[PDB]
RNA sequence: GAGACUCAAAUAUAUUAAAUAGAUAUCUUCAGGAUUAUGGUGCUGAAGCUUAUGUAUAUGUAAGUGGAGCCGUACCUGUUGGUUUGUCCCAUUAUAAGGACACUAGCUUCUUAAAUGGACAAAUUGCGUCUAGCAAUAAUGAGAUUGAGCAAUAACAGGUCUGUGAUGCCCUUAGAUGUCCUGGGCUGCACGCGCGCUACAAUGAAAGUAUCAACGUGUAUUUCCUAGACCGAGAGGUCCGGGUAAACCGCUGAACCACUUUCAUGCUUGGGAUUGUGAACUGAAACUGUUCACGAUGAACUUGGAAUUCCCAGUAAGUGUGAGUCAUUAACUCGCAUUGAUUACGUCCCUGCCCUUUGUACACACC
């Protein structure tokens, strides 16, 4: 009868993750979407390391490359006609929303 | 020749190959002889020290 | 069991299925080098069944005792071929069929309070063995 | 001794003290509190410095 | 209530040498049961004096590379050696140990860079820290060569230097290699 | 059909360098196929700020 | 060059002879019983385990790689 | 006790080693067969070097000569798939020493990959021999 | 969890020590909290000090944290 | 430029934060002790035991059998499931509130942050040129939680035309240096040289037992991670899953080390090069070999000359593991954790290096 819709949020900027809890959850608990707070995911840090010189002739140094990906989880207990407006607004650069229908 | 001696003041350590504090040091029974000996290894102030050769100190200035 | 340490508590229980006729001996108990690291055979079979004491805490804390999750992580402390030492998988063999030696799935139907508690009743007697 | 003070902590210590010695305290922890008022900073260890140095000279 | 070092008493162990008293803090403040401390014992220059001794010995005998790193093996070897030093000369083996450590002190001259030349001259007195900590070092070696190609084990080998350094040492052991060194620096002095 | 051997779905040949078509210096496996010297050029803006 | 390669054996011809040497030799251990000749290295430990009639022994060290003993001092 | 230093075919036994490790002194057999062929000849492995009187060690020779009837499988042998006569052997310093130059002298006519490398002195298993082996 | 066959057991020294204080800090008594510290703090073996000394990351050009390997015919 | 700054466990969860962990709590279920209280029972045959066949060997019973225990509960010690706005409601197939109760019949310590806290230094100290008088003293998450990245002006005939559709010019083009095919080689060897691997053994090589990681990684236009059963000396193979990943592999329950034994220093059981043989795997294809299994084969090697490298706290070294390349191939390189020392806390002899002074007959600068 009543639906539970878990909505994960992934991005790279933690500020954009601070920007999606800035306005999505506040425009939903006015109508009580049962957010269960900002559910933090552990980050998926990506390390690559490479040499610097093409044609590696001399002083064999290296060069480390880092990448930080972060999520935060918003689960909701509401039917699908409720959450349709929240998918439209608010939108954010670099952030991704994953809600499946079927 | 079982003379003991305790230090009143450190002077400079001529380190580089043989770190030793050339230190002014007086005896216990002959405490008026504040001789300036050279002690290989790490030392602290007021450290009592065994000795046999208590006669001349290999004079080096600073 | 979570009593005193299972050095000798393994050692007694190895005798008891050997006592009770439930040996269920592998026919190559004097052949196998119990894994791809040993230069010599084991001394005897008296380890081969004895890891019921290990699963009594691993059914308790790790998993239902699947044989692939079993043989991997215990009994690997090896020096393999000379460039250099590495890890192993120990490749058990017949103690896949040591469930028959006991007579989503569960691995023992008697290690809940039935025959594990006998070993507890052995170690409660071993409290009285260690009473002097 | 070995923790000397750089230019920015030195060249701002004067320009706040000769102006706002009035209504200024000796208490470093509230002198921590007043640096965000009378000037701006991008980072909190600089207020650990630029309040620490003015209080290491305030009694002087 | 401060007792039970490993099996026996801890205190009433005096250092029988001026001038090493109050320098090797044995047991009058630090009733420590184990030779194992974790945190940090060389932070500034002044840290090897506020510490026990068997914690240094168990830090010391882990050597050779293939044995270095392992302090628990050193926890094995000295406590079982301690029973050999308790069974013979039924005095507390720490009282043997402090008598072992002061006879093994190279309380003499050494060699030093000349302020006009090379390492020729006489560092006429040695530091008490170098007296104690090389005395740990000069015995730590000789346990191994007493068991390199002998079938015998270093438990009884390290028991051999503790019995002779406690007294005046006999013919050259791990306790020696220093008393001979006292002579060749007395040759320049 | 003819004169083209090498059933290329085994070995390095030929799963090679979908960013530069250069073989002997390849980063193959991260889902990149980048020819790591070209990854120097195109490190950005495919994330990968250096930090430490 | 030391050789020491003796008859590794139960050593019955000196079994009664090693039976009497342990008094008053309180430094008994697997090295010193093979420091005495006709070397058994392992069962000469067991020779003192055959001395475990609670007589002339005090087995106080029971370990891997060393089992150090003491004679039964009265 | 009694006699300790025995004599078996083309070997000898010391009076200190266990019966399993002194079995390795025989050529052609390592410490594999300490548990394999001695318990198959019901020799007690904890017995010392003075023991195992000759009424027991001759049965070990029957395992040496006839390994197939003593429950030793084919993937626990020395040489498999002869292929000459197809039979399987474990040979202890009697025929194995002749079997070294055997299977080399056949391949000299064949001049195979690993055949003719034994003339000048090299390695038949592939290592870059240009650097090592001066 | 974590740690090792030495290190993880050393954290248990911090485990027993702080529990007695916190149960005495709020529940039993101020001086009961006091009488378990003073007898401890004479040397105390840092039973409550959680040193943050963890391992130090590597560097390229070496095998380890700070060591390296050299003499390419220098 | 340096610093400042950015990135990393220590830091009040005091705030909201979990399909990670869970703390808990009790509901439980997985129940021994008699540690408990015993009610019934106890020498009367209990407990325990076998035989018979049926049922598809277990079980039933009697006999067999045997001479004290039997059986139930609670307390003590353990699985489990939900304990999400708890219970009982409901709508619902079942969560919630709506209905009340504890009014909290599981909350956030915890891992995770998303924050701000965070030695945040007038911290006192016979004041050094009134200023940068070490002192260890003060804290008691904090005596830097502490390493990295970052890097100016001028330069080198350093290296890279073989990383590129970066390129001058040079060269070539149906007869290619281009190109695809089949081969071969890049691996071949009297020899020299460097990075690096296991050693040379009782602190050891074996057997056993105990039983601690962390960085990570894992398959939808490519064969990944593998759970489970099963078979096989092994190698592996079969059958059936999980998993696009806090959720599964996985609580990755890593190694060395701890604990009894076998050994009895004897090129030994140290050390595994060395060569046969079969059995295997991956792939069209394995041959100074693609690697891998067994039972043989046990050499050099016993601490290594002159020379000579590396480094100061969780560091050195010992000890694994992941990733990187990868049809299969680490024996190397980057990262990760574990075990954990000695020694310096200095100085300018040493090779050093920084525009201070001075010397010159040195240009391409003491080669």
From Swiss-Prot, chain B:
Pfam families: Ribosomal_S28e
GO cellular component terms given for this protein: cytosolic ribosome; cytosolic small ribosomal subunit
GO annotation, biological process: cytoplasmic translation; maturation of SSU-rRNA; ribosomal small subunit assembly
Keyword list, A-Z: Ribonucleoprotein, Ribosomal protein
InterPro entries to which the protein is assigned, alphabetical: NA-bd_OB-fold (IPR012340), Ribosomal_eS28 (IPR000289), Ribosomal_eS28_CS (IPR028626)
CDD domains: S1_S28E
GO molecular function, one term: structural constituent of ribosome
Keyword Ribosomal protein on entry: yes
Family membership noted in the UniProt record: Belongs to the eukaryotic ribosomal protein eS28 family.
Stored HAMAP family: Ribosomal_eS28
Protein name according to UniProt: Small ribosomal subunit protein eS28
Species this chain originates from: Drosophila melanogaster
Organism lineage: Eukaryota, Metazoa, Ecdysozoa, Arthropoda, Hexapoda
Gene this protein is translated from: RpS28b
UniProtKB/Swiss-Prot annotation, chain C:
Transmembrane segments: none
GO MF annotation list: RNA binding; structural constituent of ribosome
PROSITE patterns: RIBOSOMAL_S19E
Record keywords, A-Z: Ribonucleoprotein, Ribosomal protein
One GO CC annotation: cytosolic ribosome
Disulfide bonds: none
SMART domains: Ribosomal_S19e
Pfam families hit by this protein: Ribosomal_S19e
GO BP terms in the entry: cytoplasmic translation; ribosomal small subunit assembly
PANTHER family per record: 40S RIBOSOMAL PROTEIN S19
Family classification: Belongs to the eukaryotic ribosomal protein eS19 family.
Protein name per its UniProtKB record: Small ribosomal subunit protein eS19A
Lineage: Eukaryota, Metazoa, Ecdysozoa, Arthropoda, Hexapoda
Gene assigned in the entry: RpS19a
Curated annotation (Swiss-Prot), chain F:
Residues at which Zn(2+) binds: 17, 20, 35, 38
Cofactor: Zn(2+)
Endoplasmic reticulum listed as a keyword: yes
Keyword vocabulary terms for this entry: Cytoplasm, Endoplasmic reticulum, Metal-binding, Ribonucleoprotein, Ribosomal protein, Zinc
UniProt entry tagged with the keyword Membrane: no
UniProt-listed Gene3D superfamilies: 30s Ribosomal Protein S14, Chain N (4.10.830.10)
One Gene Ontology MF term: zinc ion binding
Name of a matching Pfam family: Ribosomal_S14
Name used for this protein in its record: Small ribosomal subunit protein uS14
Lineage: Eukaryota, Metazoa, Ecdysozoa, Arthropoda, Hexapoda
Gene: RpS29
UniProtKB/Swiss-Prot annotation, chain G:
GO annotation (BP), single: cytoplasmic translation
Keyword set, alphabetical order: Ribonucleoprotein, Ribosomal protein
GO MF annotations, alphabetized: structural constituent of ribosome
Source superkingdom: Eukaryota
Covalent S-S links between cysteines: none
GO CC terms of this entry: cytosolic ribosome; cytosolic small ribosomal subunit
Sequence similarity: Belongs to the eukaryotic ribosomal protein eS25 family.
Name under which the protein is recorded: Small ribosomal subunit protein eS25
Source species of the chain: Drosophila melanogaster
Highest classification ranks of the organism: Eukaryota, Metazoa, Ecdysozoa, Arthropoda, Hexapoda
Complete-protein stretch covered: 40 to 113 of 117
């Amino acid at each position: 009868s009543v639906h539970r819709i878990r909505i994960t949020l992934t991005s790279r900027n933690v500020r954009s993750l601070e920007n999606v809890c800035r306005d999505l959850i506040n425009g939903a608990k006015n109508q009580n979407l049962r957010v269960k707070g900002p559910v933090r995911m552990p980050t998926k840090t990506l390390r690559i390391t490479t040499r610097k010189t093409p044609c590696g002739e001399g002083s064999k140094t290296w060069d480390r490359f880092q990448m930080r990906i972060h999520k935060r989880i918003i689960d909701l207990h509401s039917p699908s006609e409720i959450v349709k407006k929240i998918t439209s607004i608010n939108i954010e650069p670099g952030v991704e929303v994953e809600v499946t229908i079927a | 020749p079982v003379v003991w001696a305790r230090v009143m003041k450190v002077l400079g350590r001529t380190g580089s190959q043989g770190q030793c504090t050339q230190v002014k040091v007086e005896f216990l029974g002959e405490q008026n002889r504040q001789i300036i000996r050279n002690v290989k290894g790490p030392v602290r102030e007021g450290d009592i020290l065994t000795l046999l050769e208590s006669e001349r100190e290999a004079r080096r200035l600073r | 069991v979570k009593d005193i340490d299972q050095h000798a508590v393994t050692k007694a229980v190895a005798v008891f299925l050997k006592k009770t006729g439930k040996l269920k001996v592998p026919d190559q108990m004097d052949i196998v080098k119990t894994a791809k690291f040993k230069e010599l055979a084991p001394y005897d079979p008296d380890w081969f069944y004895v890891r019921c004491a290990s699963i009594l805490r691993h059914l308790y804390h790790r998993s239902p005792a699947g044989v692939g999750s079993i043989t991997k992580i215990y009994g690997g402390r090896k020096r393999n071929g000379v460039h250099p030492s590495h890890f192993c998988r120990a490749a058990d063999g017949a103690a896949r069929k040591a469930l028959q030696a006991l007579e989503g799935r569960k691995l023992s139907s008697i290690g809940q309070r039935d025959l594990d508690r006998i070993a507890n009743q052995i170690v409660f007697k071993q409290r009285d063995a260690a009473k002097q | 001794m070995g923790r000397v003070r750089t230019k920015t902590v030195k060249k701002a210590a004067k320009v706040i003290i000769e102006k706002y010695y009035t209504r200024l305290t000796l208490d470093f922890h509230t002198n921590k509190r007043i640096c965000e008022e009378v000037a701006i900073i991008p980072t909190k260890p600089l207020r650990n410095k630029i309040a620490g140095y003015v209080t290491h000279l305030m009694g002087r | 209530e401060i007792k039970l070092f490993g099996r026996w008493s801890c205190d009433d162990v005096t250092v029988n040498d001026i001038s090493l008293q109050d320098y090797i803090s044995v047991k009058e403040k630090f009733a420590r049961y184990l030779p194992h401390s974790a945190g940090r014992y060389a932070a500034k220059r002044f840290r090897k004096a506020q510490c026990p001794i068997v914690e240094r010995l168990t830090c010391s005998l882990m050597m050779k590379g293939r044995n270095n790193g392992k302090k628990l093996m050193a926890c094995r070897i000295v406590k079982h050696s301690f029973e050999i030093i308790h069974l013979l000369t039924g005095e507390n083996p720490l009282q043997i140990l402090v008598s072992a450590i002061i006879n093994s002190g190279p309380r003499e001259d050494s060699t030093r860079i000349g302020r006009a030349g090379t390492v020729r001259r006489q560092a006429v007195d040695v530091s008490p820290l170098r007296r104690v900590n090389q005395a740990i070092w000069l015995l730590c070696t000789g346990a191994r060569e007493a068991a390199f190609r002998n079938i015998k084990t270093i438990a009884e080998c390290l028991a051999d230097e503790l019995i002779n350094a406690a007294k005046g040492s006999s013919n050259s052991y791990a306790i020696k290699k220093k008393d001979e060194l006292e002579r060749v620096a007395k040759s320049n002095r | 059909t003819l004169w083209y051997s090498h059933p290329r779905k085994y070995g390095q040949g030929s799963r090679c360098c979908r960013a530069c078509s250069n073989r002997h210096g390849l980063i193959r496996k991260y889902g990149l196929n980048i020819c790591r010297q070209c990854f120097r050029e195109y490190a950005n803006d495919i994330g990968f700020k250096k930090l430490d | 060059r030391d050789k020491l390669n003796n008859q590794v054996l139960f050593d019955k011809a000196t079994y009664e002879k090693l039976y009497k040497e342990v008094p008053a030799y309180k430094l008994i251990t697997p090295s010193v019983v093979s420091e005495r000749l006709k070397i058994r290295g392992s069962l000469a430990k067991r020779a003192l385990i055959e001395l475990r009639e609670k007589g002339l022994i005090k087995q106080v060290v029971q370990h891997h790689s060393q089992v150090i003993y003491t004679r039964a001092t009265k | 006790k009694f006699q300790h230093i025995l004599r078996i075919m083309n070997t000898n036994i010391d009076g200190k080693r266990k019966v399993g490790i002194a079995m390795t002194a025989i050529k052609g057999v390592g410490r594999r067969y300490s548990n394999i062929v001695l318990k198959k000849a019901d020799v007690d492995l904890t017995k010392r070097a003075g023991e195992c009187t000759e009424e027991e060690v001759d049965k070990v020779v029957t395992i040496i000569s006839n390994p197939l009837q003593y429950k030793v499988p084919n993937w626990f042998l020395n040489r498999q798939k002869d292929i000459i006569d197809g039979k399987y052997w474990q040979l202890t310093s009697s025929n194995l020493d002749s079997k070294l130059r055997d299977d080399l002298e056949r391949l000299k006519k064949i001049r195979s990959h690993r055949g003719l490398r034994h003339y000048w002195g090299l390695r038949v298993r592939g290592q870059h021999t240009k650097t090592t082996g001066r | 969890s974590g740690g090792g066959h030495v290190a993880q057991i050393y954290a248990i020294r911090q485990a027993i020590s702080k529990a007695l204080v916190a149960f005495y800090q709020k529940y039993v008594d101020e001086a009961s909290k006091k009488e378990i510290k003073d007898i401890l703090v004479q040397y105390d073996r840092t039973l409550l000090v959680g040193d943050p000394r963890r391992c130090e990351p590597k560097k390229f050009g070496g095998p380890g944290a700070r060591a390296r390997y050299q003499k390419s015919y220098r």
